[PDB]
Design a protein around this ligand. Structure first.
Ligand SMILES: NC(=O)c1ccc[n+]([C@@H]2O[C@H](COP(=O)([O-])OP(=O)(O)OC[C@H]3O[C@@H](n4cnc5c(N)ncnc54)[C@H](O)[C@@H]3O)[C@@H](O)[C@H]2O)c1
Lengths: 493, 492, 492, 492
C-alpha cells in the first residue's frame, strides 16, 4: 500500500466534522517518506481559522466540563474501543506519512489507546480534598478543568502525541485544539474523527494544520487556557515567551541527549539489545533516546562488536512490510541534517563503524525515499558536536569510561535532562546511579519502556511538566479552594 | 514606633548578615507610620546575586541528602523559634510595613504555621511504586528542584517569605529570596531563624533589590524555579525572562475579586465580611473582595451598615494595641490610591466616607502616609475603580438583581484570584462557588485562607499555588525509574 | 460577449503556452458580464514554478548581456505590437475582467506607453563615475537583479502585468508573473507579444495559481525580487515569506484615499472629479477617492449634482461602446460590496442612490455580477465603510468646515496611497498636498496618474514605486567599483 | 587604557542622557584590551522605546519643516564638532571596541566626512517637475519618512551610528539608534554632538539593549523605517518583524568576499592588499576578503610574503600609536573565532601562522581577548572556514588555475558584499569585476570604500545602500502631485 495513497478530505477538523481553513498562513506539502511522493499539499491555518477552532472548542468545553468524571470516563473508553477496532487502519496511515515501520506503529497505537483508557479511569476518581477546620468550619477543593487547551504536536510520534496530549486534557474536563506538525498532518484527523464517533460534543477535539505562524496564533489566543508543547529547545523557548503575554501555564517536552551507562558487571545480551532500543527505534528520531552510550573500558570491545553486529542486521525497507524495522527518515531536509552530523563526527575524530550513509533499497518504488543506514560511532569524546547536540537520527555515540563517579559527571554534563539508562546487576550501584542522574525518566537494565502509568518529562533544558501517570492531572486541571464558614464572622473592626 | 533604623547589613549570605558585593541601585526603606527613613541600602548587583546563588546550591547539595523527616525536624525548629520571637518579628514587621500589630501577629502566626504544615508534609513526602507487566515494576523519586528564587511583595513581607520558603525547603530545595525594596527588613529575621534552626549555611539567602536584582535572579543558570508575588505587568516580565532558561514559574498576580451579597444572607456577618474583605492591611491585600455586589432588595440597609462600621475603624500608630488600620506602604502608593478615588468620583461614583488624607492626633505621626477607609456607591462595571486593582482601602459597591446577572459580571475580569458569597441557601452557595472563576472562594466569610488548602490564581491572577498539598508539585519534580526484572525483548 | 472560452494552455514559458507540470488545485475563471465560466485551469505547483524560474534564469543570462539601447529596441517592438492588437487585448480584458471597453482601451494605452517609457529609460540607464583622491576613481555599474516575481491583481490585469514587466525587463531582468486566479487570460497575451517582439524565450513567464503558487514564487531561491499588488493582509504574507530568502519587496496595498472638495473650487469639475475618483472599473480601483470630504457651504449642491450624474452611468455589457460600468469581478466580491452597503445603512449612512443589484435589460447578462453605483451621505469617520477599503462603487460623502479639520481627518488612516483636493486657491492647493500623507495627490482632477511620475504607497498602502524614474532603483542595483591608480598603502 | 569607566547614563532622549524608564534585562560592556567592565547598563524596555520613538516624532515634525540647506547648515556643524573632538571620540571608540587608535582615527574621519557628504546632499535634495499633455504638469516632493530606527553593530560603533544617522537626518527624518550591547558608549558622544550642533532635542535618540529592545523598535507603529547592520540570521528576523507593520527595511548582513590574485599582478601590492582585506579591525569587518584566491604560478611566493608580513603585525595596547591589532570584541567571539580555526585544522587545512591565543607583554593586558592573526593554506571550497563568515583575523588561501574557474568559485556563496581582483590586465580587471556578484568590487586595492559611492550587499549580504546618492532613495520617498491645468473630462 506504499506509494498508493493521497489525502482526499480536508485537513482541519471543527464542529465534529472536517473543514478547510477559513484564512491561511502558508502552504505546506506532506510527503510519503518511503517513496518521496506528495501525499498532501495543504493550507496552514490562519488567525480567523484558529479563532474559529478555539471558539468552537470553548462551546464544547462548556458541555464537557458539566459531566462527572465517570461520565467523561464512559466516552473516553468508547474512543479507546474505536482505536482498537481501527488500529490497522490508523497504523497504516501513520506509517505512510511518518515513515516508521508498521511493527512500531502498531505499538504506537497501543500506547495511544492505553493512554485514553488509563486517563478515563483517572477521570472517574478525580477528586479534591475536604479538610476539617477549627470551630466546626471546613474547606474543600474543586478539581476543575482549565478550559480550551492547546496541543502542539511533533512529527516523530504523531498519533501518539495527539493521544498523549488530548487524553489527560479531555479526561480532566478540558477541550483541545491540536496543531499537528506540518510534516505529519494526516493521522491526527483520524483521532479527531474517533473522538466524535465515541460521542464527545462536537468541537471537543479540534485540529488545525499549520506551522510556526499557526502555533503562534494558538498560543496567543485569549481563550486558550493552557499550552502543551513537544518539540525543540529553541521553539519551546519561543512557546513560553508567547504564553507570557497571556499568563498561560505551559508544559514542555524539549528532546534530549540522554545517557546510557553500561557497566562491566551488566548482562551483555540485555545491554546490547538495550543500546539498540535506545538508539534506532523510529529511525533514531526519538527525544528520550540513549544516544550517549557510555561503556566501561573492560567490556568496550565485546559490547561494540556485538552492537555493530546487531545494528547491521536491522531490516530497512517498506514501512508497511512486517519484517521491516527501520523505514525512511521523516523528510529529506532532516535526512541531510542527520547525515551532516555524521560528516562532522568523522572530522572531529570519531570512527564510523557501520552505516551513516545513504541507503538505496532494492524496491524501485522506494528509490526516492529518505533512507540511510543506522550508524554506530566509537572513539567519541564529550567535546564532540555529535555528542552534545541532539541528532534525532540513527546515530549511536559510544564513549568509554573507567569509574562510576567519572561517568556520572559526564552523564550529567548536559543542559538536557529528559531520560537516562544504566545497565548493571549490582543493586546498590543501579539505584545510586539513577538517583544521581539529572533526568526525568531513568531505565535500569532496559530502555524506551516508559509505561503509561508513570510520568514522562524533562529535567533542565528538556522541559518541565509531565505526560502519562497521575501528576499530569495537575497540569490539565486546577484546584479551587472553597472555605465554608460554619459560624459567624468575627470582625477585627 | 518612631525610633528605629537598621544598624546591620541587609543582605544575608553564608548564614550571616552581610553587605552586597556589588550594586544595581540604592533604595530607601521607610517607617510608613512616621514617614522617616529606617534604611538607605544597596540593591544587589549581578556578582552579589551570583554569590548568593552558588552559596545556596552548596547548601542544596547538603540539604537534599536529608530525608523528609530529617528536614521536618529542622523546619519544626524554625517554626518554634518564630513563636518565641513573635513580638520581635511582628513589631519589626509593623515598623516597616505599617499594618497593625494586631494583623502582624496574625501574619507571623500564619507564617510559622506554614512552616509546621510543610515540615509535616516533608515527613510523608513520597513518590509511587507501581507493579508493571511481566513482573517488572517502576517507581517515582520525588526530588527537589535545586536553587529556588523567591521574589516577595511589600504587603505581607514576612508571611510571603515564609509561604515561599516553607514548601521549597520542605521539598529539599534551597532558596534565594529577594524582598520588595520597599520592605527589606523582616526577611532577614527569617534568615536568622533558619540559621538558628540548623539549616546548612546558604539554604535561605536574602538579596535586596528591585527590577535589576530580580532580573539577575531569574536569569541565573543555576536557578531551578521562580515563585513570584506581585503585579500582572511585572509577573508578565517574570515569565518572559524564565523562558530564556526554561525555568518553571508560579505566579500570584493580585486580583479584582467579587463579593456577592444575597438578600437571604445573615446581614451582620455579610457586613463584617465586606469590611474584612476590604480594609485589612490598609486594603493592600492580594485577594481583597473589592467589587462588593449587593442584591437590590438589601442594597440600602447593607450600605448603611458597612459605612457605619467603616467609620469606627481606629487609624493610628500600628504599635498601639487598638489600631486596626495603619499607614499605607509609602507616599507614592498613597497618591496612587488617592488618584483612584478622584477618578472614581469623576466617573460618577458617590464617596460615602473616607478616601481622603487622614492626619492623626499624635504629633509623631504627622508625616505618616495615612488615609481614611473609603466606601464607594453608585459604581458601574466600566469604572476604573471597578476594573483595576487599587490595592488600597476602597470598596466599590454595585447593585444586582438576579443570580444569573451577578455571575456574569463577577467573572467579567481578567483576574481570578478570590471571590466571596454570602447566602444561607445551601444550593445557591455551592452553585455560585462552582461557577465563580476564582482560585479561592469563601462561603459566608472572607479572607480566611487556611494553610491546609491551596491559595492561587485563575486566569490572569496567575497559576500555581501556595499552601495546601498541591503546592508540593511546584517545588518538587518526579523522576520515573523503570526497573527491568526480566530480559530485554529487542525489535531487531 | 457571451461567446468566449479559453481553448489553449494558460501558463507560458519558453516562448510558448504550456500546462503546469504539477498542481496546486484548480480555479474557475468567469465572464463577469454573464457569469459564464470561460476557463477551468490548474494552479501551478512547486515543480512548475521551478521550471518557470530556471527558464527565466536562462533567459535572464541572455537578456542582461544586451545594452540598454539593445533592450530598448525590443521593448519598443513590444510596445508597437500592443498598439496593433490593442482592441483584441481590450476585448479579452473586458470578457474576463468586466470593465468597459472604454476603460479597457485606456488601460492598454497606458500599458504600451509604460513599455515605451521604460524602453527609453533603459537606453540611458547608467551608474556613476567619481574622481577620488590620489588620481584613483570609482564607478557604479547599474546591474539587473535577476528573476523578478510579479504578483498580479484582478482589477487591472493587463496593465498590472505591463507595469511590473516594463521596468523589470528594461533594467535587464526577467520576470515570472503570477496573475490573479480570477483574471488569468490577459497576461498571456503580453507573454505572446514579448516573444514576437524578440525577447529570449523565457524572459517573461506566466504561472497561474493562487496563494500556494504565489508562496512557491516568493520562496524560490532563484527569485531576486518580488513586486506585489493586493491587500494589506496578503502583502504582510509576501514580506514574511521574502524574509526567508532576503529578497527585496515593493508593495502596493490599496487605500482609502480622501478627496477634499473646498467651496471655492469649480463645482462642475469637482463633481466630475468625484465620479472619476469612485466609479472607474466598477469602483475596483485601489487609489480611488472613496472618502469625499465636501465643505459644508457646498454640501447640498455638490451632493445633488453628484447623485444626478451617478444615476446616469450606463451599466451593461462592457463590450458596448456606450458602457461605462460593467459587472463586478465575481459573485463573492459583489456580495462583499453589497454587504458594505447594507452595514453602512445600519450604521446610520443614507443611501442616496445605488448599492443594490442591477438587472440589465439584455437577457444574456442576467447572471452577470451587476450593481448600481452607490452614493452615501450622513457618513461618519468611525463608520466601517469609511475606514475600510470597499473596492466597489460606493462613494461616502462627508462634510467638513476648516482646512485644519479636514487635513487631520484625511490623514487619519493607516492607508496612504492617493489623495485629491479641489480648490482654486494656489496656496491652499499646494499646502493641502504637502500635509496629505499620501503617495499621489491630485489637484483639480483625479485618477490621472501619468507614467512619467511615480505611483506608490505611503504607510500601510505599501512602499516602492511603479512608473517614473525612481522605479529603476527597485529593479536594478548599484555595484561600486574602486579602481586603484597607485600603490596599496599598508597599515602593517 | 584600563582607566576608563562609564559615569553617566547611556540612553539619550530629549537632548540629555537619561536612564531608561523600564528594563528588558542587564548587559555588561567591557574594555576588550583588559577585560575590566566599563559599563553595566539597563536594556531599554517597551515603555522606554515608546518614549524615545515618541520624542523623536516631535523632533521630526520640527526638523522636516526646515529646507535641505537649513538642515545642511546644522549637519555641517555636527561634522565640525566631530573634528574638534576627534581625538576624544577615537580614544573612547578604542576603549570599548578594541581597535587600534590608528584605525579609530580613520573611523572618526570617515564619520564626519559622511556627515559633510550628506549635509551637501541635503542641500541639493530635490524632486522632479515634468510638463504633461494639455498644459497640465506634475511634480514630485522628496519627503522624509518620519522616525527611522538604526540598529548598530559592534565592529564600527561610531561609524555605523554615523553611516546610519547622517543620510537619515539629511533627508529630514529623526532616528532612534540601538547600538549593539557590546559597544554602547560611543553612540552617546554622537548624540551629544548632534545636540551641540543644534538639532531639535529628540532628533537623534539612543536606546541601549539587545534583541528585545530591537524587537520593540522594529514593531513600534510610529517607526517609519529600519536600518540594520549585522548577521544573516538576525537581519532575516528583522525583516519578519517589519512585515507586521509594512515597514521598509535596508540590510547589510556581512559576507564571505573573495579576493582574486592573478599572476600578472604587482606582488608587493597584492600582498599588502591581502593583509588589508583580512586583518583590519582584528578581522572583524563587514566586507573583508577572507577567501584569497591565488593563481597557482604565484601561490608559493605570495603565501610566504603574506605570512612574513602577517607575523610583523604589532599586537598590543589599542591606545598605543604603534599598535595595529588590538583584542577581539569579547571572550565569546574570540572563542567562536578560535573554533573556526579548530574546525579548519580538522578539515585538513594547514595553519601557516597564528590562530592561537596571544598573551601580551604589558601586564595590564593579561585578561584581554588577544589572538595572533591567522593564515590558512591547503583550503577547499567545501570547508566550513571557507564558506562561513568567521569575523576574525583568519585568511583562507586557495589556489586556482584559470579565470573562468575562479569566477565560478568566487561566486559559489550565498553572500555578496564585497570582492577583490589584483591584476594589471585592463580587460581582465573590468571583466572579473563585472562578473563578480558583489556589492563593492576593489581593483588593485581592498577595503577602500569611499563615501561618494554606495556600499551594500548583493544576495544574502542584504539590500539597500549606505553612502553615495542612492541611499537617499531609502531615507526619502516621492509624493507625486498632478496639477490639472484644464477641466475634468468625465467618462460618464
Ligand atoms: N493595490 C491595488 O492596486 C489592488 C488591486 C486589486 C485589489 N486590491 C485589494 O486586494 C483586496 C483583496 O482582493 P484579493 O483577494 O485580490 O487580494 P489578494 O492580495 O489576496 O490577491 C492578490 C494576489 O496575491 C496572490 N496571493 C494570495 N495569497 C498569497 C500568498 N499567501 N502568497 C503569495 N501570493 C498570494 C493572489 O493569488 C493574487 O494574485 C481587494 O479587495 C482590494 O482591496 C488592491
Amino acid at each position: 500500500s506504499t506509494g498508493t495513497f493521497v489525502v482526499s478530505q480536508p485537513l482541519n477538523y471543527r464542529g465534529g466534522a472536517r473543514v478547510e481553513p477559513a484564512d491561511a498562513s502558508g502552504t505546506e506539502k506532506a510527503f510519503e517518506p518511503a517513496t518521496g511522493r506528495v501525499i498532501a499539499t495543504f493550507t496552514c491555518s490562519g488567525e480567523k481559522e484558529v479563532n474559529l477552532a478555539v471558539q468552537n472548542a470553548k462551546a464544547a468545553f462548556k458541555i464537557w466540563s458539566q459531566k462527572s468524571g465517570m461520565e467523561r470516563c464512559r466516552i473516553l473508553l468508547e474512543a479507546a474501543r474505536i482505536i482498537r477496532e481501527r488500529e490497522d487502519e490508523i497504523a497504516t496511515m501513520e506509517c505512510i506519512n511518518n515513515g516508521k515501520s508498521i511493527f512500531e506503529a502498531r505499538l504506537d497505537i497501543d500506547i495511544s489507546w492505553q493512554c485514553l483508557e488509563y486517563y478515563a479511569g483517572l477521570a472517574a476518581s478525580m477528586a479534591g480534598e475536604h479538610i476539617q477546620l477549627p470551630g466546626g468550619s471546613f474547606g474543600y477543593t474543586r478539581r476543575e478543568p482549565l478550559g480550551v487547551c492547546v496541543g502542539i504536536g511533533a512529527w516523530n510520534y504523531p498519533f501518539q502525541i495527539a493521544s498523549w496530549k488530548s487524553a489527560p486534557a479531555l479526561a480532566c474536563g478540558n477541550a483541545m485544539v491540536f496543531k499537528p506538525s506540518p510534516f505529519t498532518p494526516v493521522s491526527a484527523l483520524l483521532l479527531a474523527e474517533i473522538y466524535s464517533e465515541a460521542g464527545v460534543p462536537p468541537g471537543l477535539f479540534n485540529v488545525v494544520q499549520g506551522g510556526a505562524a499557526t502555533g503562534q496564533f494558538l498560543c496567543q489566543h485569549p481563550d486558550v487556557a493552557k499550552v502543551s508543547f513537544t518539540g525543540s529547545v529553541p521553539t519551546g523557548m519561543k512557546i513560553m515567551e508567547m504564553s507570557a503575554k497571556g499568563i498561560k501555564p505551559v508544559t514542555l517536552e524539549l528532546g534530549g541527549k540522554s545517557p546510557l551507562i553500561i557497566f562491566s558487571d551488566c548482562d551483555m545480551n540485555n545491554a546490547v539489545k538495550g543500546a539498540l532500543m535506545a538508539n534506532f527505534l523510529t529511525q533514531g528520531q526519538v527525544c528520550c533516546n540513549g544516544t550517549r552510550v557510555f561503556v566501561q573500558k573492560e567490556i568496550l570491545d565485546k559490547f561494540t562488536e556485538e552492537v555493530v553486529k546487531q545494528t547491521q542486521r536491522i531490516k530497512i525497507g517498506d514501512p508497511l512490510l512486517e519484517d521491516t524495522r527501520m523505514g525512511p527518515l521523516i523528510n529529506r531536509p532532516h535526512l541531510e541534517r542527520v547525515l551532516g552530523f555524521v560528516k562532522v563526527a568523522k572530522e572531529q575524530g570519531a570512527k564510523v563503524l557501520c552505516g551513516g550513509d545513504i541507503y538505496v533499497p532494492e524496491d524501485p518504488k522506494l528509490k526516492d525515499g529518505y533512507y540511510m543506514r543506522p550508524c554506530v560511532l566509537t572513539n567519541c569524546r564529550d567535546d564532540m558536536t555529535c555528542v552534545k547536540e541532539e541528532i534525532f537520527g540513527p546515530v549511536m555515540s559510544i564513549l568509554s569510561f573507567d569509574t562510576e563517579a567519572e561517568v556520572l559527571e559526564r552523564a550529567n554534563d548536559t543542559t538536557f535532562g529528559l531520560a537516562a539508562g544504566v545497565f548493571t546487576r549490582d543493586i546498590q550501584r543501579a539505584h545510586r546511579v539513577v538517583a544521581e542522574l539529572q533526568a526525568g525518566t531513568c531505565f535500569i537494565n532496559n530502555y524506551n519502556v516508559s509505561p503509561v502509568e508513570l510520568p514522562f518529562g524533562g529535567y533542565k533544558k528538556s522541559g518541565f511538566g509531565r505526560e502519562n501517570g497521575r501528576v499530569t492531572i495537575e497540569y490539565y486541571s486546577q484546584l479551587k479552594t472553597v472555605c465554608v464558614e460554619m459560624g459567624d464572622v468575627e470582625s477585627a473592626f
